[PDB]
C-alpha cells in the first residue's frame, strides 16, 4: 500500500571489527527495492523529534517509497562499542552504507541526511569510495572539524562549543551504560551547572584541568584541549582535502549565525565544480532556527522553512537516487536569505558571481576606542598615519554577544552590541549613515596592521550594522591569534613592539545595510567565551593559571603606510 | 516483535453524518489487542514534528505496544468535511472513539494526549459518555472557549490570539482545499503579513472589518468577534460544567505564561476530587517551552522536560488504560516549576494546601502614575483617603509586553516592563525592598476601587518581580471589562463618576520574590493587543472606528474606606 511503512527498531548491523550498532528501519510499504536514506545520530536515534525540526519533514520520503535507517553512533545508546568522537564514523559509515547496500530492500541508491554531527558523518561517509552512496546532504556541518566547531580559521580555541557539547553528550553517555551508578547523580547536576554557566565554566583556570568532563569523556582534553595546533591528530579526521576529488551532489545548509556557517559554506566550494550541489543559508543560529531574536527579528518567512526544505531534499534524492532528471527543474542552485531587505533571494552561484571584495579602509581623528571615539570607515585610504591603543587584560575579556555562539547564549545571533560599546578595548569604525542600500554578500575578511607588547596576543574584527535607532547589531566576526598569523599548523612569536599585517576571517554574510544605517566595525583582542583568552606570554595558553597570563598593550596602525582594512564582498543590483 | 511497529496512512472513519475523517494508525507489532490512544489535530495528521516538541516522545509508546491513531479534524488535509472551530469536535471524538473500540487491534482501553487544539479536543472527547475513553492527557487547554483562548474571564476579546491563529489557519485551509486557486499566492503574502505584525492587524477598525479572514474563515467574525457576550453560542462549545460530573482520569500540563494558564488550572480543580488528575506546569508561554527570555532565564531544568514528559504519560496511561495498580508510584499529583528560587518542586494538590489569601493594598504618599511615582503596597490598610488618576486613550493604549501573549510577540512571558514605566497612564505600586523571601504560588486577584468618566471602560492589573538590576518582570495579569463587572452574560453600563468596587482575575503564578526584589503592581486600562482596547462608548466595540471612541479619566481610589488590593496566594516554607 502507497503511503504505508513499518518500523524495525535495533536491527544490530556488524561492523568490521564485529562490533554491531544499531539502527532502526523505516521501510515503506513496496514490492521490491527502494531507494535508502542514512541519518547517524549520537543524540539517541529513538528520539528523533530532537533533531528533525532542523531537518526536514523526513516520513515524507518514506511515504513517498524511500527506506531510512537511523543508527546510533559506535558506543551510544543501543550501539555497541567506545564512544570517541569523530574517530570511527568513517570506517563505520563504510561498514554501515555496504550493510544496506547487501539488503533485499535496498535498489542500490542511497542517500543522507541531517544536521549537526548528523551533517559532519555525512562527510565522513562521502570519503568512504562507496558507489552506492549517491548523493549527501549536510545542515550546518563542516568537512574539517579544527576549522569547525573546536578551533577556527584563526586559531583560537573554541572554549564555549567544546564545554558545552562535552556536556552534553556526557549527559548521553551516562544514560547510555549498562547500569545506574551511584555518582550518575551528582554529575547529572554537575553537568547542568555547566550547561547553565558555559562561560563560568570555560572561565576555570588552568584550562586543561576538568575533573568531570575529563572523566566522562577524556576526548575533551586529550585531542581537543591537548591539541592547540591544527597537526596531525586533527589532518587524521578532516575531510576537506579529500572533497575536491569527489563527484557527490551535496545538498548543503547553513545558517549567518551558525558555528559552522565558514567551514558549511568551504563545503560548497569544494565539491560544486564536479557534482550537483546546492546551497541553502538562513539567518539562524545553531539552537535557534526561529528568525526572530531579543532585538532582532527577520519575520516568519525566516523561520526555518521546513516543508520546503523537504520537498526540496525530496526533489534532490529524486534526481539523483531515482535518475528522475528533471526533478530538480526550477530549483535554484543557491537560495539566501538576505538580512536588511529580510528575503530569500536565488542566486546561481556561491561567491555570488560580480562580487566587488572592496576594501573599507580604518581612519578618523583622534583615538577610535569605544562607540563615541572618532573611529571611521571609508573606501578611500587614510591620509594621516595614527594609530589607536588599549589594554587587553586577560582577566577582564570582552564579552561574547551573539555571532556564531553556540551552548553559550547560542540563541541570540544578531545580538546587540550597545552593552560593550564603552569598553577602551572596543575599537570601534563606522561608516557616515548610509543615503543609499549597501549590500554585502559573500565571504568577509579584515586585513590589520598589528603590534603588541606581547610575543603572542589576539586580534579580533567584529562587522556590525549601525540601526537608525542605536542598535547596533552583530553581522559576522573572526579572530586572528597571532602565533598562528601565517600557519596553523607551524606557529611561531612575535617580536614585541613589531608591526605585522594579519588576516581575520570573518566567515561571511548577506547584509543589506539599509538606507539610514550605518556599517561599522568593532577590532579588540578577545571575545570570550565564544573563543578562549590569548594569556599573552607565549605559553601553552590552556596550561595556564590566570595569575600567570599577562596584560598586553595592543596597537592598530591605520593610515598611507599601514593601510588596515575590512574587505567586504560588496554586490550592486540595479 | 517487541519494539517493532507499523503505520496505516490515511485509514477512512465514518462520522454519524457520513463525512469521513483521515486517521494514521501507528500500530504495535502485537499478538492481540491493544490499548491507543487518540490525538485530533488541525494541523496536518502527518506533520507530527510540528506539535510533538510540545507534548511527548510518543513513538516510545508505540514500542512499549500502545497504538497511537492521529486524526486530521474535519474539513482539513485529508478529511472529508467543512472545517468551523470546535463545533463538531465533540461528536467527531465520539464518532472516532467509537470506531476506534470496534477495530481488532483495540483491547477496549482508549486514552488521548497533546496540546492546544490536540488538549482542547480531550475535554470534547470527554463528555462525549463512551465508557472505553479511561484516560486523557490535555497540554495547555481550556474547558472554556470564551474564557481561553478568546476571551477571558474579564470579558476583554484576546484579539491577538484570534487574528494570529486565524491567520494560520488561513494558511492551513488554502494548503488543504482541492485545486490551488489564482488567489492563494496573494492570500499567503497577506497571511504572512498579519503574522508579522499582529498588533497592526489588531488596530484597523472597526475591528469587525477583517476582509481576509472573514473569507478564509468567516467563523473569526460570525462568532468570535460578533459575540463579545458569554451567551449561548460559546455556552454551547464549554465543556466546563459537565466536567464536574465526569470521573476521568487527567493529566493537565500548563504553562505560568501560557494563554490558557488559568483555565488550565481551572479544569484541574475541577476533576480532581471524582478521579486521578496530575497536574504540571513550567514557566512556558504558548511558543517558548525552552525556559530562555530576552531578559530572564529559568535555567536548563525549565527546559520543556519531554523525556520525563514521556515517562509520566506512559505512568499514568499504565495505571489508567492497562490496569497497573502501582504504575504511579512515587510520581506526585502537582509539580510545579516554582519561579525565582526556579526549581521545579511537587505538592499534594493545588491550590496549595495552607495558601494564605493575603491582601496588599495600594498605597503611598503623591500620585502613583509611572514608576518614579509614590505608589506603594502593604499588607497594613491604608490610613488617608486618595485616589490615582490617568486618561486612558484609545488611539494610544499600553502596550502589551509579555504575559500571556500567544501570537503577538508570545515567546518573552517574563518580560522586562520597564519600557512602559515612563507612562502617565501606567500607574505602579511596590513593596519595600524585601528583606526575605516571600513566595506568591496560586490564583491571584485584584479588588480594586474604580471609578470612569465613562459609561464603560478597562481596568488591568499586573504582578511584576522588580530585580536588584532594575529589571522588572511581569509574572501574571488580568483585566476587567467594566460593562462585565458582575457577569459576562448579561453585561450593564457604569455610571460616569461613581465608585464601584471591581475584581481582576490575574490567573495564576509561582514565584518567590528574593531578597533584593519588590512585589510590584502595574494599574492602568488597557493591555493592546492581548487584549482590545475599549472604546469607552458603551457600544458595540468591535463596530466602532477610531474616531468614534472617546477618551476617559479613570480613576484608581485607595484609603481606609476604598481599599483597593491585590489579593497574593501566600505560601510560607519554613
Ligand atoms: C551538532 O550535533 O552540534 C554540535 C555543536 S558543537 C556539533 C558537534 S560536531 O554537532
Ligand atoms: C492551539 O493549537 O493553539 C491555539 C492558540 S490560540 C489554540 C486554539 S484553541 O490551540
Ligand atoms: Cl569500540
Ligand atoms: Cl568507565
Ligand atoms: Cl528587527
Ligand atoms: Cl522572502
Ligand atoms: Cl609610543
Ligand atoms: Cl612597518
Ligand atoms: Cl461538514
Ligand atoms: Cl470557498
Ligand atoms: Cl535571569
Ligand atoms: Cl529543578
Ligand atoms: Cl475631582
Ligand atoms: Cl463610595
Known amino acids: 500500500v502507497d503511503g504505508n511503512y513499518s518500523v524495525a527498531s535495533n536491527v544490530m548491523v556488524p561492523m568490521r571489527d564485529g562490533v554491531r550498532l544499531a539502527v532502526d528501519l523505516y521501510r515503506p510499504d513496496a514490492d521490491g527495492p527502494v531507494p535508502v536514506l542514512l541519518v547517524r545520530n549520537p543524540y539517541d536515534k529513538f528520539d528523533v523529534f530532537a533533531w528533525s525540526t532542523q531537518s526536514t519533514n523526513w516520513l515524507e520520503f518514506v511515504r513517498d517509497g524511500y527506506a531510512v535507517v537511523i543508527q546510533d553512533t559506535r558506543g551510544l545508546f543501543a550501539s555497541e562499542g567506545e564512544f570517541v568522537p569523530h574517530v570511527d564514523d568513517e570506517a563505520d559509515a563504510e561498514d554501515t552504507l555496504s550493510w544496506i547496500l547487501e539488503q533485499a530492500w535496498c535498489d542500490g541508491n542511497v542517500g543522507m541526511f541531517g544536521v549537526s554531527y548528523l551533517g559532519v558523518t555525512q562527510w565522513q561517509a562521502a570519503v568512504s569510495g562507496v558507489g552506492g552512496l549517491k548523493a549527501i546532504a549536510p545542515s550546518m556541518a563542516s568537512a574539517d572539524l579544527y576549522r569547525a566547531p573546536w578551533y577556527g580559521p584563526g586559531g583560537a580555541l573554541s572554549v564555549e562549543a567544546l564545554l558545552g557539547w562535552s556536556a552534553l553528550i556526557g549527559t548521553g553517555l551516562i544514560t547510555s551504560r549498562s547500569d545506574a551508578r551511584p555518582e550518575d547523580a551528582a554529575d547529572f547536576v554537575q553537568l547542568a551547572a555547566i550547561l547553565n554557566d558555559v562561560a563560568g565554566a570555560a572561565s576555570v583556570t588552568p584550562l586543561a584541568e576538568q575533573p568531570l568532563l575529563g572523566r566522562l569523556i577524556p576526548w575533551v582534553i586529550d585531542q581537543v584541549v591537548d591539541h592547540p595546533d591544527n597537526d596531525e591528530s586533527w589532518q587524521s579526521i578532516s575531510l576537506f582535502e579529500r572533497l575536491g576529488g569527489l563527484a557527490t551532489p551535496a545538498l548543503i545548509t547553513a545558517g549567518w549565525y551558525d558555528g559552522f556557517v565558514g567551514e558549511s559554506l568551504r563545503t560548497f566550494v569544494a565539491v560544486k565544480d564536479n557534482a550537483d550541489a546546492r546551497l541553502v543559508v538562513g539567518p539562524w543560529s545553531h539552537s535557534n532556527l526561529t528568525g526572530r531574536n531579543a ?205 605585522y599585517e594579519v588576516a581575520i576571517d570573518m566567515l561571511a554574510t548577506s547584509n543589506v545595510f539599509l538606507p539610514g544605517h550605518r556599517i561599522m566595525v568593532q577590532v579588540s583582542s578577545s571575545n570570550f567565551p565564544k573563543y578562549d583568552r590569548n594569556s599573552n606570554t607565549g605559553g601553552v595558553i590552556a596550561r595556564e593559571q590566570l595569575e600567570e597570563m599577562c596584560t598586553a598593550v595592543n596597537r592598530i596602525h591605520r593610515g598611507p603606510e599601514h593601510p588596515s582594512h575590512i574587505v567586504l564582498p560588496i554586490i550592486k543590483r540595479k
Open 295 to 499: 532585538d532582532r527579528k527577520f519575520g516568519i518567512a525566516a523561520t526555518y522553512p521546513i516543508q520546503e526544505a523537504t520537498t526540496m531534499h525530496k526533489a534532490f534524492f529524486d534526481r539523483h537516487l531515482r535518475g528522475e532528471t528533471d526533478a530538480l527543474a526550477g530549483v535554484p542552485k543557491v537560495r539566501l536569505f538576505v538580512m536588511g531587505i529580510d528575503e530569500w533571494r536565488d542566486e546561481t552561484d556561491w561567491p555570488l558571481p560580480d562580487t566587488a571584495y572592496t576594501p573599507f579602509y580604518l581612519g578618523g581623528s583622534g583615538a577610535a576606542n569605544t562607540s563615541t571615539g572618532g573611529g571611521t570607515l571609508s573606501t578611500s585610504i587614510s591620509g594621516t598615519e595614527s594609530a589607536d591603543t588599549y589594554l587587553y587584560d586577560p582577566a577582564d575579556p570582552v564579552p561574547s554577544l551573539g555571532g556564531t555562539l553556540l551552548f553559550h547564549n547560542g540563541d541570540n545571533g544578531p545580538a546587540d552590541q550597545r552593552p560593550i560599546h564603552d569598553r577602551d578595548d572596543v575599537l570601534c569604525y563606522s561608516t557616515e549613515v548610509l543615503t543609499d542600500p549597501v549590500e554585502v554578500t559573500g565571504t568577509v575578511s579584515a586585513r590589520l596592521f598589528v603590534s603588541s607588547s606581547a610575543v603572542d596576543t589576539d586580534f579580533t574584527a567584529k562587522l556590525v550594522d549601525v540601526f537608525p535607532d542605536g542598535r547596533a547589531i552583530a553581522l559576522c566576526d573572526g579572530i586572528v591569534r597571532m602565533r598562528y598569523r601565517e600557519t596553523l599548523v607551524n606557529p611561531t612569536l612575535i617580536e614585541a613592539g613589531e608591526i
